[PDB]
Amino acid sequence: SKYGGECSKEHNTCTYRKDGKDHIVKCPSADNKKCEKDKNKCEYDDHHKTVDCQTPV
């Protein structure tokens, strides 16, 4: 139910892989969820319906 990707700092987006396709969604604007570092791990959680561009590492 979690789908991983990488984020764009410039666009504040997460590009994640799900069911063979790449999907681009905006990251949150929240301080500790936005894409802070370019190409950082992000995740779309399809169960909780959330995006985080500061996935714990």
Q: Could you give the CA distance from residue 47 to residue 9 in angstroms, rounded to a whole number? A: 25
> How many chain residues are in contact with Cl ion, going by CB under 5 A?
5
Q: Does 17 help bind Cl ion (rule: CB under 5 A)?
A: no
Amino acid code (one letter) for 25: V
Q: Does 48 help bind Cl ion (rule: CB under 5 A)?
A: no
Q: Per-residue contact track with Cl ion, 20 to 39, x per CB under 5 A?
A: -xx-----x-----------
Residues within the interface to Cl ion (CB under 5 A): 21-22, 28, 50-51
